[model samples]
Target: APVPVTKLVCDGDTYKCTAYLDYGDGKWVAQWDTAVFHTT
Candidate 1:
């Protein structure tokens, strides 16, 4: 129930910064604290 996070996006490749939430779920569910890490 930790929902409601509008939207955001960034990229260092694949996904370096990504936050999304489309509750009622049909898709869009990835919130690793908005993610941030990279290089491989």
Candidate 2:
């Protein structure tokens, strides 16, 4: 089953984004490494 997306946190330097997943009560999980193009 797919969990609900609680929030999304990202970084400017790393140029990566994280997806926060919320599952069964108070148990939240997250993952990173979303590629984002950064230009100077």
Question: lDDT per residue, candidate 2, 1-40, as tens digits?
Answer: 8888888888777867767777777457675776666579
Candidate 1 wrong stretches, greater than 4 Å: 20-40
**CA RMSD of each candidate after superposition:** 7.0, 3.0
TM-score for each model: 0.26, 0.49
Measured on C-alpha atoms, candidate 1 has an lDDT of: 0.61
- Residue 1, candidate 1: alpha-carbon lDDT: 68
List the lowest-lDDT window of 10 residues for candidate 1. 26-35
The reply for model 2, stretches above 4 Å from the true place, is: 24-40
